[PDB]
Amino acid sequence: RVPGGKRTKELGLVVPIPEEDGLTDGQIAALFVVALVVLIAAVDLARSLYFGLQPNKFKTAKGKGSITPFMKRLIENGF
Amino acid sequence: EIVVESIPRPEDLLESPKFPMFEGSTGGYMSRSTRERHAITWTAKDQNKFEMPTGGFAIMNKGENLCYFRKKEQCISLGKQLRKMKIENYKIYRLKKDGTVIFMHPADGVFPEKVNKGRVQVNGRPFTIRGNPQQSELKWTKYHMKSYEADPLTTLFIKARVMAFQDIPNLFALPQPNMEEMVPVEEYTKQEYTTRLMEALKRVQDDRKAKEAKSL
Amino acid sequence: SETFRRRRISEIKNGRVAMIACMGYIAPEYFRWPGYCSPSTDLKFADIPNGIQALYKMPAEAWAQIGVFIAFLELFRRGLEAEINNGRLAMVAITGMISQNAFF
Amino acid sequence: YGDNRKWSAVLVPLTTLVFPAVAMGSFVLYSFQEDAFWRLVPGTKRAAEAEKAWREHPLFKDSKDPMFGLLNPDDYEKGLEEAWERAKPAGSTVTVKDKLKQLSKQDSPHWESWRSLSA
Amino acid sequence: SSKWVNPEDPEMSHPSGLYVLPLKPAKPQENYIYTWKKGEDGSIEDYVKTPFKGPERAADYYTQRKGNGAWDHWGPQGE
Amino acid sequence: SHAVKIYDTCIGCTLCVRACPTDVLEMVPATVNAAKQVASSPRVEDCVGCKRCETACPTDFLSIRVYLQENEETQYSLGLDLADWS
Amino acid sequence: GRFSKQFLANLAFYRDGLKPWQRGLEIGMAHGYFLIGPFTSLGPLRNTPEAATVGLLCGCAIVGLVSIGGLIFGSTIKPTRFDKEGDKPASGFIEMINWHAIGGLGGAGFAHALITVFG
Amino acid sequence: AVGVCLPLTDKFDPLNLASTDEKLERYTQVEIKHGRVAMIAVVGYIMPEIFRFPGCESFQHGLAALESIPLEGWVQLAALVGAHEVLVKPRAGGLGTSDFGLGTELLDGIEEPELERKLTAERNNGRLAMVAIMGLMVQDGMFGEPPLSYMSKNGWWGEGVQYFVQHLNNCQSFSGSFVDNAGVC
Numbered sequence A: 001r002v003p004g005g006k007r008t009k010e011l012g013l014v015v016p017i018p019e020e021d022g023l024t025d026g027q028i029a030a031l032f033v034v035a036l037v038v039l040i041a042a043v044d045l046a047r048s049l050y051f052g053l054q055p056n057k058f059k060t061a062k063g064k065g066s067i068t069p070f071m072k073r074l075i076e077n078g079f
Numbered sequence B: 001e002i003v004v005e006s007i008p009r010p011e012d013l014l015e016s017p018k019f020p021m022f023e024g025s026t027g028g029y030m031s032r033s034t035r036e037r038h039a040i041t042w043t044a045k046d047q048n049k050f051e052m053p054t055g056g057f058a059i060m061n062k063g064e065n066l067c068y069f070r071k072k073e074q075c076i077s078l079g080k081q082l083r084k085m086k087i088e089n090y091k092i093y094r095l096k097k098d099g100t101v102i103f104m105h106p107a108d109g110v111f112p113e114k115v116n117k118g119r120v121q122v123n124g125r126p127f128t129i130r131g132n133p134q135q136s137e138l139k140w141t142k143y144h145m146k147s148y149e150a151d152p153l154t155t156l157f158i159k160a161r162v163m164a165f166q167d168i169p170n171l172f173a174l175p176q177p178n179m180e181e182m183v184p185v186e187e188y189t190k191q192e193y194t195t196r197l198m199e200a201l202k203r204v205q206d207d208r209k210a211k212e213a214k215s216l
Numbered sequence C: 001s002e003t004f005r006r007r008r009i010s011e012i013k014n015g016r017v018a019m020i021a022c023m024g025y026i027a028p029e030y031f032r033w034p035g036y037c038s039p040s041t042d043l044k045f046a047d048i049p050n051g052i053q054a055l056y057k058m059p060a061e062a063w064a065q066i067g068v069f070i071a072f073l074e075l076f077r078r079g080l081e082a083e084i085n086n087g088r089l090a091m092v093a094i095t096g097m098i099s100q101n102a103f104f
Numbered sequence D: 001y002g003d004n005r006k007w008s009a010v011l012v013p014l015t016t017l018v019f020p021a022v023a024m025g026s027f028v029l030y031s032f033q034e035d036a037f038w039r040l041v042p043g044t045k046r047a048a049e050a051e052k053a054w055r056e057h058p059l060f061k062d063s064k065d066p067m068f069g070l071l072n073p074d075d076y077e078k079g080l081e082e083a084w085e086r087a088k089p090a091g092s093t094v095t096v097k098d099k100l101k102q103l104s105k106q107d108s109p110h111w112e113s114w115r116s117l118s119a
Numbered sequence E: 001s002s003k004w005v006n007p008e009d010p011e012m013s014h015p016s017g018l019y020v021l022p023l024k025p026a027k028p029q030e031n032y033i034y035t036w037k038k039g040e041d042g043s044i045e046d047y048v049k050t051p052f053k054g055p056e057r058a059a060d061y062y063t064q065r066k067g068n069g070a071w072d073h074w075g076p077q078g079e
Numbered sequence F: 001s002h003a004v005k006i007y008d009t010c011i012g013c014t015l016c017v018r019a020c021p022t023d024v025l026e027m028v029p030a031t032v033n034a035a036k037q038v039a040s041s042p043r044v045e046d047c048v049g050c051k052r053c054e055t056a057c058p059t060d061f062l063s064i065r066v067y068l069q070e071n072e073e074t075q076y077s078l079g080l081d082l083a084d085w086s
Numbered sequence G: 001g002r003f004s005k006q007f008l009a010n011l012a013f014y015r016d017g018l019k020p021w022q023r024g025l026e027i028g029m030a031h032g033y034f035l036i037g038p039f040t041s042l043g044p045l046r047n048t049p050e051a052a053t054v055g056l057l058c059g060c061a062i063v064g065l066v067s068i069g070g071l072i073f074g075s076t077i078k079p080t081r082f083d084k085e086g087d088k089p090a091s092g093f094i095e096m097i098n099w100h101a102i103g104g105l106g107g108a109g110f111a112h113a114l115i116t117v118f119g
Numbered sequence H: 001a002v003g004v005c006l007p008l009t010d011k012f013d014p015l016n017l018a019s020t021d022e023k024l025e026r027y028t029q030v031e032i033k034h035g036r037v038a039m040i041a042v043v044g045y046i047m048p049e050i051f052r053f054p055g056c057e058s059f060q061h062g063l064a065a066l067e068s069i070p071l072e073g074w075v076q077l078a079a080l081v082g083a084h085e086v087l088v089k090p091r092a093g094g095l096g097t098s099d100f101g102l103g104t105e106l107l108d109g110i111e112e113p114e115l116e117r118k119l120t121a122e123r124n125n126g127r128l129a130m131v132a133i134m135g136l137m138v139q140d141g142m143f144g145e146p147p148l149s150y151m152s153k154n155g156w157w158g159e160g161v162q163y164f165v166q167h168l169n170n171c172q173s174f175s176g177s178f179v180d181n182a183g184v185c
C-alpha cells in the first residue's frame, strides 16, 4: 500500500493480506444458492405487495376461509 | 338562442379576410404536435393596434376579426384587452381535432362578471370556510382526504359526532362480538332481526349496569 | 416488381465488376504496366504483388484516389443476355479466385 | 489471495451494468402500461376494479359512507322529526326529511372526474 | 338554463360548465400529417397537410384519448 | 384539476370573476348577501391554480378557495401549449 | 428553403421509395462507421496494438445500445409512419431499427477492416 | 399465447416454418422435448464439477465422458432413455403430446393465465438451456475440458478472448505486465 495517513506513516500501521482467499468456490456457490432462494422469495413478496389484498377471493377461491381459534380469542378480547 | 359560429379548422382556413393583420412569430401554436385550438371572433368599429398573446403585435380589421390560439388563457387575455378597448361582442370557441366547435367564454351570452338569471351556484358551500369537517374525522370514507368536498349533511353529522364523543363518561362501548356464533351466509324479517338485536343490546346494558353496580 | 428490378440492376453491376476483377487478376501475371506506380516512395508495378497483397502493398493514398474515381463514376437483346451470362460466369470466377487466394 | 476475482469479473458487470440497464428498459416499458402506477395515478382500471371488489365484499360494501353506523335510521329519523316539531318556528314549512335530502345533495360536478377513465 | 346534462349525476350541473351545446361540422376533419409534396416539376413544399390512415403513434396512451373532455368525462352531448 | 369552492361569506363584488385568467367563475343570483349575487365556479376544469381570485377576494378570510390537486393535473390546469393531451 | 427541403426529404429517414430495412441499413452503416473511430483514437487502449479492435467492440456496443433504445421507443410510442397497410403498428419502425443494428455492425466492421488493412 | 413473453409482442417465426396447425403442433412438441433435455443436460454439465457420485469419480466429465464411460454403460443409459421414450405415452385428455401426466397435479384446477405462465416459463427455460448446452458442448470440444473447469483455470475470458482484455485492470495479461492476472478473468 501507499499509505496517505499521517498516523499510519508514523506508527507503521499495516493492512496484512492473507496468502490464500478465505472462502473457496464451493462455499461461495453455497452462499449464492441461498441468495438465489432469497431472491426468488423476494420477487414473490414484491409481487404480493404490489397486488395487495384480493377481497374477491371469496367468490371463486377454494375452501370457506378459516380464522384460527387464537385469532378468534383476540377478536373477542378486542383491542 | 345563442348561435355557434362555423369557425373552420385553422388548417383548412389558410387565408381569410377575417384574420387581422399581424406580424407573426414563433409563439404561435405548434401545428405539428397539437390539434386542439381556440378561436376568438370579434367585431371592431375601427382598426386598433393590439398585442397578440403569442409574440408580436397586430392590427384588427374594421369589421369581423378572427384569431387562433392554443389556450383558453391566451384567448381570454386577448378578450380582456379587447374589453379594455370597448369591444364587447367577442366570443371564444374551442375547436376539437375533428372540427367540433364549443362556444366557451360568454357561456350564456352574458359576461360572467354580470349577474344573469338562470345561473345556479356550483361548488358552493353553505358555511364559512372554517366550517369544513376535520380531515381526520372522515377517513377511509368517500372523502378520505378531501374534507372540502364533503356535503353539508356530512359536515353536520361529523361535527355532531365530535361533540358527542367528548362526553367520555357515558358512551356506549360496543359489545365484543361472539365469534363462536358464526354461520354460513346461506344458513325472517329485517325488522325482526333489528328487534332481536335491540333485545340483545338491552340485555347487554342491563348486564353492564349490574356489573358496575356490584362494586361502587 | 421493385425488388426484382433492384436485384436485376445489382446483378448486372456485380457481373460487370466481376468481369473487370477477373481481368485484373489475370492480366498482371502476363504483363504489368511500367512507370513507377508511386514515384515518391520508389514503388513500381514489377515490385507490387498481384492479389489481396496489393491492398497492403500499394499506398492507402493510391487506394483512396481509386476509390474517389469510382465514387465519381457512380455519382455522376441477345447482347444483354450474353452480358448477364458472362456476368454470372465472371462472378463465379472472381469469388472462386479471391477465396482461393485468401485460403492459400 | 485474490483468486476469487474471477467471480467479480462476472458479477460486478452483470450487477452494475447489465442488471441496471435491463431494469431501466423494463421500467420505461412498464411506464407505458395501462396501469403504470395504479396506486398513485388516478383513473386506473385496476384501481377501479379493486374498489369494486372491496364494495362486493359484504363487510365493506358500505364502509365508505360517512353516515354509516346508525343501527336504526328509522328511529333516528323519528326522533329528529320530534325535535324539529318541538323547535319549529311558527309557520315553518321546512320538514326534516326534505332538509336532510337538501343537505345531502350538493353541486360539485368536478369532484374526482377522473373516475370516467376507469369507467 | 344550461342545455348540457351531466351524465354521471343528472341533478348536478355538467362538468363543462357551458350553456350552449357544441356544433358538429358538416364533415369531421380526418387525421393528417405535415410532410413534403414533391411537385413533379422539381419543386417541393414543406408543410403540406396530407391524410393519414390511422393514428400517427399507435400507443395505447395516444389512442385512448378522445378529446371529449379533460378525462373524456363529458356525456354524448360533448360530441 | 383543481377544486375551486365558494362559501356563503361571499359578498358578490365580482373581483374574483374579473381576475379570472381563464374565465372559470361567474356571478349568479342569490339572496344570502346584500349584493344579491354570489360567485360560482362552473368551469373548474379550466382552473390553472394561479390563486388570483384568492388574491382579489376582500373578505377577512377568503370566500373563494382554490385547492391544488397535483395528482389530478390535466393539460388545461397545466396550461400546456407545445404538447396536446386531447 | 428549397435546398433544405430537398436535403431533408432525401435523408434516409424520409427518402421516397425506400423500404424500412433500406432506411435502417443505410443509417446504421453510417452510424457504426463513424462510431468506431472515437474509441479507437481516444480510448484507454488507444496506444495498445488492439486499439482498433477494442474500438470496434465499443462501437458495436454503442450501436446495440441505441438500437435497444429504438426498440423500446417503437414498443412504447409505436410510430406508424413506416408501417405497411394492414400491418401491425410499429412493425415498419421495428424493422428499421433492427436493420439499423445490422448496418451499424456492418459499418463498424468495415471501418475496422479499412483501418487494419491500410494502417 | 404460450411461448410469447414481454420482450416479443408477437410470435417469433421469421421463416414462417409453422405455416399450418399441424406443423406448429409438431414444432411445439419437438421444442418442448428439446428444451427439457437441454435443461437437464445443462445441470448435468454444472453438477459433476461440484461433486461425483460414488464410483463415477474416475470418469471424465464433458464430451470426454463419451470416450471415458464404457460403451456398455452408454448402451445401458441409451436403453433406459429408449425404454422411457417407448413405454410412456401422453396422458389421455392431456394438454397435448408434450405432456405425460408427470406433476399434472400441480397444474390441475388452476387459472388459465397461471397455466400459460408455467408453460411459457418451461419453454423459455428450455430455449435458454438449448443455447447454453450448445455453448457448453462447443466450448468443451474446442478447449478440451468442461467449461466450468476451464473457467476456474482461465476465467470468463480464456485463450480466445483474453487478447481483448489483456490490458484491463485485474485482467492484464499483456507481455511485460507487472502481474499476469490472466486466470482471474
Ligand code: CLA
Pocket (backbone or CB within 6 Å): A028, A031, A032, A035, D007, D008, D009, D011, D012, D015
Ligand atoms: C446487501 C449486502 C451486500 C452488499 C452491499 C454487497 C456489495 C458488493 N458485493 Mg456482494 N454479496 C452479498 C451481499 C452484499 N454484497 C452476499 C450475501 C453475497 C454472498 C452470495 C455476496 C457475494 C459477493 C461476491 C462473490 C462478490 C460480491 C461483490 C460485491 C460488490 C459488487 C456487487 C456484486 O457484484 O454483487 C454480487 C452479489 C450478489 C448478486 C448477491 C446478492 C447481493 C445482495 C444480497 C443484494 C441485496 C439487494 C438490496 C437489499 C436491494 C437492491 C435494490 C435495487 C433494485 C437497487 C460490492 C462490494 C464482488 C466484489 O467483491 O467485488 C470486489 C464479488 O465478486 N458480493
Ligand code: CLA
Pocket (backbone or CB within 6 Å): A036, A037, A040, A041, A044, H035, H036, H037, H039, H040, H095, H098, H099, H100, H101, H102, H103, H104, H106, H107, H118, H119, H121, H122, H125, H126
Ligand atoms: C423451469 C422449467 C420448467 C417448468 C416451468 C415446467 C413446467 C411444467 N412441466 Mg416440466 N419439465 C422441466 C422443466 C420445467 N417444467 C424439465 C427440465 C423436464 C425434464 C426432466 C420436465 C419434464 C416434464 C414432463 C415430462 C412434464 C412436465 C410437465 C410440466 C407441467 C407440470 C406442472 C407444474 O406445476 O410444473 C411447474 C413446476 C415446477 C417448475 C416446480 C417448481 C418448484 C421448483 C423446482 C423449486 C422451487 C424452489 C424455491 C427456492 C422455493 C420457493 C419458496 C417460496 C417462494 C414458496 C408444467 C407446465 C407436464 C406437462 O406437460 O403438463 C402439462 C409433463 O407431463 N415437465
Ligand code: CLA
Pocket (backbone or CB within 6 Å): G057, H131, H132, H134, H135, H136, H138, H139, H142, H143, H150, H156, H157, H158, H159, H160, H161, H164
Ligand atoms: C447463453 C449462452 C452462452 C454463454 C453464457 C456463453 C459464454 C461464453 N462463451 Mg460462448 N457460446 C455459446 C453460448 C454461450 N456462451 C454458443 C451457443 C456457442 C456455440 C456457437 C458458443 C461458442 C463459444 C466459443 C467457441 C467461445 C465461447 C466463449 C465464451 C466465453 C467468453 C465470451 C465472451 O466474453 O466473449 C467476448 C468476445 C468478444 C468481446 C469479441 C466478439 C467475438 C464474436 C464476434 C462475438 C459473436 C457473438 C456475439 C457476442 C453475440 C451477440 C448477440 C447474438 C444474439 C447475435 C464465455 C464463458 C469463448 C471462450 O473464452 O471460451 C472458453 C470462446 O472461445 N463461446
Ligand SMILES: CC(=O)O[C@H]1CC(C)(C)C(=C=C/C(C)=C/C=C/C(C)=C/C=C/C=C(C)/C=C/C=C(C)/C=C/[C@@]23O[C@]2(C)C[C@@H](O)CC3(C)C)[C@](C)(O)C1
Pocket (backbone or CB within 6 Å): H063, H137, H138, H139, H140, H141, H142
Ligand atoms: C418441408 C420443410 O420445411 O422441410 C422439413 C424437413 C425436416 C427434415 C423435417 C426439417 C428438419 C429438421 C432439420 C433440418 C434439423 C437439423 C438439425 C441440425 C442441423 C442439428 C445439428 C446439431 C449439431 C450439433 C448437436 C453439433 C454438435 C457439435 C459438437 C458437439 C462439436 C464438438 C467439437 O467440434 C468442436 C466444437 C471442436 C472440435 O475440435 C472438437 C469436437 C468435439 C469435434 C425441416 C427443414 O425443419 C422441415
Ligand code: KC2
Pocket (backbone or CB within 6 Å): C037, C038, C039, C040, C041, C058, C059, C061, C062, C063, C065, C066, C069
Ligand atoms: C484512376 C484513378 C486516378 C485518378 C483519376 C487520378 C488523378 C490524379 C490527378 C488528376 C487531377 C492528379 C494531379 C494526380 C496526382 C497524383 N496521383 Mg493519382 N489518380 C488516380 C489513381 C492514382 C493511383 C493509383 C496513384 C496515384 C498517385 C498519384 C500521385 C503520387 C505519386 C507518388 O507516389 O509519388 C500524384 C501526384 C500515386 C500515389 O498516390 O502514390 C502515393 C498512386 O499510386 N493516382 N492523380
Ligand SMILES: CC1=C(C#C/C(C)=C/C=C/C(C)=C/C=C/C=C(C)/C=C/C=C(C)/C=C/[C@@]23O[C@]2(C)C[C@@H](O)CC3(C)C)C(C)(C)C[C@H](O)C1
Pocket (backbone or CB within 6 Å): A025, A026, A027, A029, A030, A033, H050, H051
Ligand atoms: C420421476 C419419476 C420417478 C423417478 C425417478 C428417479 C429414480 C429419479 C432420480 C433422480 C436423482 C437421482 C436426482 C438427483 C438429484 C441430485 C441433486 C439435485 C443434487 C444437488 C446438489 C447440489 C445442488 C449441491 C450443491 C453444492 O453443495 C455442493 C455439493 C458443494 C457445496 O460446496 C455447495 C454446492 C452448492 C456447490 C419414479 C419414482 C421412478 C416414477 C415416477 O412416476 C416418476
Ligand SMILES: CC1=C(/C=C/C(C)=C/C=C/C(C)=C/C=C/C=C(C)/C=C/C=C(C)/C=C/C2=C(C)CCCC2(C)C)C(C)(C)CCC1
Pocket (backbone or CB within 6 Å): G025, G029, G030, G031, G033, G034, G102, G103, G105, G106, G107, G109, G110
Ligand atoms: C457538416 C460538415 C462536415 C460533415 C461531415 C460528415 C458528418 C460526414 C460523415 C461521414 C460518415 C458518417 C461516413 C460514413 C460512411 C460509411 C460507410 C462507407 C459504410 C459502409 C458500410 C458497409 C460497406 C457495410 C457492409 C456490410 C454490412 C452493411 C452488413 C453485412 C457485412 C457488410 C460488411 C457486407 C465536414 C466534416 C465534411 C466538413 C464540412 C461541414
Ligand code: SF4
Pocket (backbone or CB within 6 Å): F006, F009, F010, F011, F012, F013, F014, F015, F016, F017, F038, F039, F056, F057, F058, F059, F063, F064
Ligand atoms: S369570491 Fe370573493 S371577490 Fe368573488 S364575489 Fe365572493 S367575496 Fe367577492
Ligand code: SF4
Pocket (backbone or CB within 6 Å): F004, F019, F020, F021, F022, F023, F024, F025, F046, F047, F048, F049, F050, F051, F052, F053, F054, F066
Ligand atoms: S386559480 Fe386562477 S384560473 Fe383558477 S379560478 Fe382562481 S383565478 Fe381562475
